[PDB]
Amino acid sequence: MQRQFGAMLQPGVNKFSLRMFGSQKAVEREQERVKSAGFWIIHPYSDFRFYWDLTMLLLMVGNLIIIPVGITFFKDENTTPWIVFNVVSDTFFLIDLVLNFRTGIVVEDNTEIILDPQRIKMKYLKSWFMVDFISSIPVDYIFLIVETRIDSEVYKTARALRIVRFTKILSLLRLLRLSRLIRYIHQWEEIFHMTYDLASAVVRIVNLIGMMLLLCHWDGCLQFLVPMLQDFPDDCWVSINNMVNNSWGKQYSYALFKAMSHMLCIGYGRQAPVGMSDVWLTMLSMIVGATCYAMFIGHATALIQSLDSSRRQYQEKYKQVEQYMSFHKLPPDTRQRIHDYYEHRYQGKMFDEESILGELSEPLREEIINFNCRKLVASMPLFANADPNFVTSMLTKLRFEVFQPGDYIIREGTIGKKMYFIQHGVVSVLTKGNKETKLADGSYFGEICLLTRGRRTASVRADTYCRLYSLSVDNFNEVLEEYPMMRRAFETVAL
Amino acid sequence: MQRQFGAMLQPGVNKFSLRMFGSQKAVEREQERVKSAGFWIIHPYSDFRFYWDLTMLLLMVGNLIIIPVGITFFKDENTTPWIVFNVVSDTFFLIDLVLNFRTGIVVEDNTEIILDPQRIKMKYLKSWFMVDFISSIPVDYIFLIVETRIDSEVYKTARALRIVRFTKILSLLRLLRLSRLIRYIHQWEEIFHMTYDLASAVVRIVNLIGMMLLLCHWDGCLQFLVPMLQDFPDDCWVSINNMVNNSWGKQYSYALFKAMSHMLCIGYGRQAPVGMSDVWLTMLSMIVGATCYAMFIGHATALIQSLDSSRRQYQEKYKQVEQYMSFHKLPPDTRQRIHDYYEHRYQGKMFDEESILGELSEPLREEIINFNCRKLVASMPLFANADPNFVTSMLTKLRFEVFQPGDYIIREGTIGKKMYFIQHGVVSVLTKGNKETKLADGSYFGEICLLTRGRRTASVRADTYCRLYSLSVDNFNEVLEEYPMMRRAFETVAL
Amino acid sequence: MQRQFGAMLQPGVNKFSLRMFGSQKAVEREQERVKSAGFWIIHPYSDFRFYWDLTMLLLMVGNLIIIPVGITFFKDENTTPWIVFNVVSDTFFLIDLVLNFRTGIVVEDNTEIILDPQRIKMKYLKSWFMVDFISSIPVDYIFLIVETRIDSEVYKTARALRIVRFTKILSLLRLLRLSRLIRYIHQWEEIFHMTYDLASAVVRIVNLIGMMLLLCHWDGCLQFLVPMLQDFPDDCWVSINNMVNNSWGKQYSYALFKAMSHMLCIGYGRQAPVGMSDVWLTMLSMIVGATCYAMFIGHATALIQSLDSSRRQYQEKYKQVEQYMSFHKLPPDTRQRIHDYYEHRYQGKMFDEESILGELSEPLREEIINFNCRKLVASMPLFANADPNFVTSMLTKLRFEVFQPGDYIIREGTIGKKMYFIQHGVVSVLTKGNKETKLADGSYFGEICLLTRGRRTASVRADTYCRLYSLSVDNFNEVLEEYPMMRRAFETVAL
Amino acid sequence: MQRQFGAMLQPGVNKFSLRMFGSQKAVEREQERVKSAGFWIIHPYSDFRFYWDLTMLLLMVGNLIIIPVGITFFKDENTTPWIVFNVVSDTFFLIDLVLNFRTGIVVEDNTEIILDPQRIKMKYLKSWFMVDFISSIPVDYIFLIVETRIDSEVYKTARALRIVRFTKILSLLRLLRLSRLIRYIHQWEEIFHMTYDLASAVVRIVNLIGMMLLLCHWDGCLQFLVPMLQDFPDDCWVSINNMVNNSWGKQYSYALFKAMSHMLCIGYGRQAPVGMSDVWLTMLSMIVGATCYAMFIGHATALIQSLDSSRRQYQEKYKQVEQYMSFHKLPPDTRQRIHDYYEHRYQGKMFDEESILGELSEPLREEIINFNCRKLVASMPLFANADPNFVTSMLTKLRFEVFQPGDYIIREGTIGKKMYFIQHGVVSVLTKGNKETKLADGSYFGEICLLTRGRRTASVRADTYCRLYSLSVDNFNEVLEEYPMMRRAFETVAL
């Protein structure tokens, strides 16, 4: 299958490519730009790069956990499965270092992914080649093989002891795979922000919890490593606690306890540090742990301030309204009225209807307005015998309004300028002759002033917290400007 | 009373139901939807569900406090009132587990509360049945009765010791009632946000203080439990402190001290942990306590940033104005003038008058404007002999303005465009002939240019920080457009 | 002087009364409302209430510091200057308790200060009378005198030892003066927010530092008090450290060290607590100190987020612009252009010119616009021979604009719509015949299209980051609408 | 070179001077104001002041690190290179104190840098002369020389021991160079905010990390100094740890460990403090360290809340939209539609197109609109045969719109009001006769209603997430108002 390998390196059409490049035609143009690049160029949004980086993350986490425990706590680090594990890992990392010479580079300074095979080489050499080249090759086995090639009988004096100490130091160059771990996790978390829309504070605090666990683990390995390379002098914390000859589990547990004690701000180990190794290592672990815990408090605060943002914005708005009422020295009755109005208008959380209906497109706006109000405008017989385009063009002019119980919605004797549709609540129509009718949901009132443009003949008082839709006369005239046939029909039926 | 039991399960008309469903008719429709559901379906907004969940919270808090202390610190946990307490509690929790098969489920993805008796079953089995079924039945007494049914003489060897240890482990399955505690507290705190409008940061920090006390209590019980199940070896913290045979109060006090020491970032107990049980338990308590204390700092910061939000927004606005003055390199005299203006305009706290008067309804706007200005427009004799509808339609066009002492409010010789009403402050009218009159609160000036639309004939200088209301000529013409009779009356009286 | 005492109780005219009540007439009305209240009613904004509360704060701070140290660390608390100090203090506090029956109460629910002498009595009894009545009277000396009146020879048995312990407990009822301390400090800090405009975060963090010092001091006194009332048993921290018989300075130093160690998250004292007194007292001090330190981190964060608010808002705006450029996939050259434009437009800090000039009054707006631009519009000979009212009405229509070097400010061949005035920068005018002139500060260009309304005849390219003022043709026509004489003059001179 | 020295003191034309003073002419005016000031006045924005302050910072950091270690840990502080180092340092600081009498003072209350040689003297004496005069002169060597001049044989009794103690105390007056360090670092960091636009939180947290390291270093020196001046009594921490006679490296390491332990909230040293020196010094270090660490948590939180500000603002906006959908009780299908629309409109991050295009200048707006849309309007044959000024004036009226798949972009039978250009996506044109054509990127539709102003004849449905540009009929008429020749050409070609 010489075509399937060429297909997997190219960025396939998925949710991510359609969201990045915009159209399917742009993704096909990107596939053609990968095709015209050269000999087997890997695009960093493909499927092969994804599954390869997934296997590399599942290998790097295991390497960064297993390798310091294998180096520091065990004495003979030349057993057969340990060498097998290191050689298999370094084989995968050399394969990844070769494949980095064929992967495109996503630059955040443009929308142009670099696919020039010479320019990716001249960028990867100038950016991240030295770290990956150190962390890929087994420098310790190179030093061991070269030292035994120089002297096959090197174990005569205590110089071979220094060779073993320097082997254990050079084998910590495999901890520079953290750079590739960080660069792969950021590169795929940006993609998963683009696709799935997860909260940014959750992602950053998961990243920080991962780094805190990894640094606590490395510091716990380090505070046993440095007394181990000094052959456990009588002032290190290992020999003071008489735990030189315990099992490696107890050594790792108590060392990780020292690291976590100086990380989460508790302290100490058994006693205070004594030797000059332990004092400076404890100060290093204290600096690293206090920095990581301060950043954890920062990410937790940024997470908590995004949980109730709408209700927080509501309370900021209502404190501004409290200041407005205090500035003009309003009586407390009106303050109770305004408080009840904001409790029954926004229901404790802030939203701006005008900006939200402005940001939406046209069919979503029409769909929301239809679902809200077409069941109400169908109940009026002036509108059921008209153009559906007239109704659709008229529904945009409705305004949502809220009235408290006791309010005069329509005061009798004024110029009628608005027509009201009832969504929720019960109103009372007072007319002359001491007649008081009740209107409820799905009803309407104030329609004579729309047609005739006269004055008010009856009062309307709200009895509950009424949610109403309003239609002005001027907006109705603007709707009649485009539809003159229904205007002439209203002129004839008005006769 | 076969009708009262059917009435209490249905959501009664209260402040909460009227605020959720909107109208009383919608609440009656919800009552009919509960009635047409099936055999005795409980609606989760009712009164019976409220008093039942209140009794369950008052039982769960007592259970989660008493049960770990009864398990870990006491030896013979088969005394009579302890068994009575457990059986009465588990009877109530089985009754609650049965009643969960008849409670509706409030889904936050819609406004449709599920009342289908088969769909609530198929949702509760797929969501939260296993946890409540474990935490309801006394699994420990089942294991004890079944073990004694298998072997009535099981106390011969030390196998019964293992049976008692496993009984004390299985009796901690009653601590999964925390799930029902959390789900009931969130479900009723959402309702009490809807009704009473309490600050969200206060509610969340009370929730966090509750969880911190409960986790400190459970960790204090755990750090005595795990050395107790190992029959107190000579490396646990209990036998090192020689407090195996103290009273249970001293044991609980010092264990809760260890838990709270590793929670509020202090440490340690007496000495550092020694055995492998204590090291990993101390690391667990350190992780839990550091996480809870970091979240406490986060909630405290989110609480503190909501206390002076209006004054903080004022200071952000004034720092923007300081940058505006620094950008155009204004002289310091004008900077002192602008500083005094913002001190005497907003009085240290930010509020936007135009947006607030826009967000309100029509009668509240009319009520605020009447209380502010009808005592001022009644003092002008041009307006006392006019339509009250004219005055009411004109009062909307007033604008609030503030002038510093030394300002020329009206400069003589310009086109008169505004008319000013005095709320607070004393102004000086300078005219020709070196005549300087003083005007004060309730007075007015600049009314000749409203009627005649000519030019200015006298200067007006502010002597104090004057709060004034202004009325433009163009807005007055717009008010006269709708009321032509008062316009003709002003034409006749102007003659 | 029977008039001076009546004058000092009334709120004098100062910066504070003029800012609260608005006008001097309102302050005189408040003085008349104090006069018509009754027999010597004290207004809480007066001068006497200020100097009285100042002396009470300077007495309460001394009492709350001296009294616990005198109670806990000294044995014979019946020496003569100690009794003199307590009697003089309690005399002042009884005088303050009497004067609280004549002080008005500032209610935050209205702008109406209560001055009814019966209603202030019925509010002060229902609000804060019990705490002040306990903290005012010397309950310890009452108990001592009554106990010696009951039995004059009470020192026979060890019952008098219990009497002395109960005397030292009852003498801590003087620590309820903290309520009056808090209520006076909030009441005058609100007034000093109103007058002097100090940052709110600074005031709240000074309040919190005061409470942290006072609670650390009280906890240090308490952790010596409770072992002292138990006659120093052999498990308290005092007898373990062999510091029962040291001087009181060393006892207070080490006790305050224990309190501050459990406050600022360090711990412990010498060893872990042992007795059941010390364990629960250490847990109490840990809870209080961890709460106070978490609130200190919260107030420090709220202080730090208000230091660079303008530059933070600038960076939020520029990150939105970076997202806008990333969304339309703009080339990097235009991104560098937009970056240079925002560096040379806002200079790293956000300010909105239109909203700031809208919020100001009319003379400040005229003063800023005159200082910015009258030196520029005087240099044009079309405007120096015109009405100063014409210039003043025209200057409002100028717009501030910024052009990068390389930009074509005027492109030749278009419809001339704007006229440009130069504030800063050097532009190049290119015309036909390959002629390139340089214009600099105080010059102007594009004035022929203002008069004639034709087309462009020469190009203008910016050579530096030019700050310019612009004047449109349509705004110039709007200025000519009100001033027809200068329009006719421009018609004649244009001929 | 008598001219080069006069040139270097004057502010040269660079990026900073051109950004501050605005124009090169203003910088030449500032050079003339420096020239007409007096005898060799140094301007604080020059090059000489920059390189001088750079050498002073590189000297002050070395002095504040070396001087306390040389004072506290070494016994004979009169060796030759130590005296050479102090005399060379104090010579440079006296030269700097002389040069402060010739440096201008940048005042933040205006844009006028003070260059009056008498007024800079009378400001520097009243502001910062005493601190710099103490920190410049070697007060310790003055006291030593004067004491030996008074008595040449002063080493007879133990009074010379007191002289040496007082010499080591007075030699800590060189630590008042911290004032000049802070005043130089703020003065140049303001300038580097003006030039290079680095994030403010990064700069403030680097400043705080510097102060935390310096205060930890000084506290570590102090907690050895105060036991050293008491000749190491048997209750200090030095003699308890038996480390009086160790090397100075071990003493400094363990003292810095005590300071850092009480700074990063860990504690203690070996044991608790015992003597009254150590208790109060430990309380001082605890207060300083807890304050610095709380400010570090504050700066870290302010840094973290500025990292994802755009995505945070997007999530706040979408939570407001979730509240809007919950308020009107929309069905979940429309909620999924609105969620998909905001995922495909803003792509997870908030930006406001209208405000951003309003804030830009005219050529940047034209350049962005040309790059977005001139490749689209060139493909329409109605526009390729027209004025390029017509196209340039018309391109401003395009609006960016986004449609979901399934939406009817054009519904057949309505009044045609808009014309649509396709940027991304594939649409389907349905017409009568069951004909369905596909249009893609670079195509256009709905142009007949622009010319004729009739009704719709075919439906257009979106099949993908289409990004379109729209052009209304009314905006097209407004474009034709200014260009009547192309309007007449469209009238003729429309025939």
Report on this model:
4 copies of one chain form a homotetramer. Chain A is α+β, with helices and mostly antiparallel strands and 495 residues long. Chain A has a domain at 353-494: Jelly Rolls (Sandwich), CATH 2.60.120. Helix content of chain A is 60%, strand content 8%. Chain A is built from 22 helices and 8 strands. Chain A has helices at residues 2-8, 15-20, 24-35, 48-72, 80-99, 117-127, 129-136, 139-150, 159-170, 178-196, 200-228, 237-240, 248-261, 276-304, 309-327, 332-343, 353-359, 362-377, 388-394, 448-452, 473-482, 484-494, and strands spanning 399-403, 408-410, 418-424, 427-431, 435-439, 444-445, 459-462, 466-472. In chain A, the strands form 2 sheets. In chain A, strands 1-8-3-6 form a 4-stranded antiparallel beta sheet. In chain A, helix 4 (48-72) runs antiparallel to helix 5 (80-99) and helix 8 packs antiparallel against helix 9 (159-170). The first copy, chain A, is elongated, with a radius of gyration of 37 Å. Chains in contact: A-B, A-C, A-D, B-C, B-D, C-D. At the C-D interface, helix 13, helix 14, helix 15, helix 16 and strand 1 of C face helix 3, helix 11, helix 14, helix 15 and helix 17 of D.
Give a summary of the structure in a few sentences.
Chains A, B, C, D: The chain crosses the membrane at residues 51-73, 81-101, 124-146, 166-186, 201-223, 279-304. Four copies of one chain form a homotetramer. The first copy, chain A, is an alpha+beta fold.
Largest interface: pair, residues per side: B-C, 67 and 63 residues
Instruction: Give a short account of the largest sheet of chain A.
Output: 4 strands, antiparallel
Give the beta-strand count of chain A.
8
Major β-sheet strand ordering of chain A: 1-8-3-6
Radius of gyration of chain A, in Å, reads 37 Å
What is the helix fraction of residues of chain A, given as a range? 55-70%
Strand content of chain A: 5-15%
Number of helices of chain A: 22
- Here the CATH topology of the domain at 353-494 in chain A equals Jelly Rolls
Name the overall outline of chain A. Answer: elongated
Give the C-level CATH assignment of the domain at 353-494 in chain A. Mainly Beta
Distance between the termini of chain A: 82 Å
Please state the structural category of chain A. Answer: alpha+beta
Tell me the series of helices and strands of chain A, N- to C-terminal.
HHHHHHHHHHHHHHHHHHHEEEEEEHEEHH
Q: What's the oligomerization state?
A: homotetramer
User: Which architecture of the domain at 353-494 in chain A does the CATH hierarchy give at level 2?
Assistant: Sandwich
CATH superfamily placement of the domain at 353-494 in chain A: Jelly Rolls
Family (chains A, B, C, D): Belongs to the potassium channel HCN family.
Organism (chains A, B, C, D): Homo sapiens
Subcellular location (chains A, B, C, D): Cell membrane
Protein name (chains A, B, C, D): Potassium/sodium hyperpolarization-activated cyclic nucleotide-gated channel 4
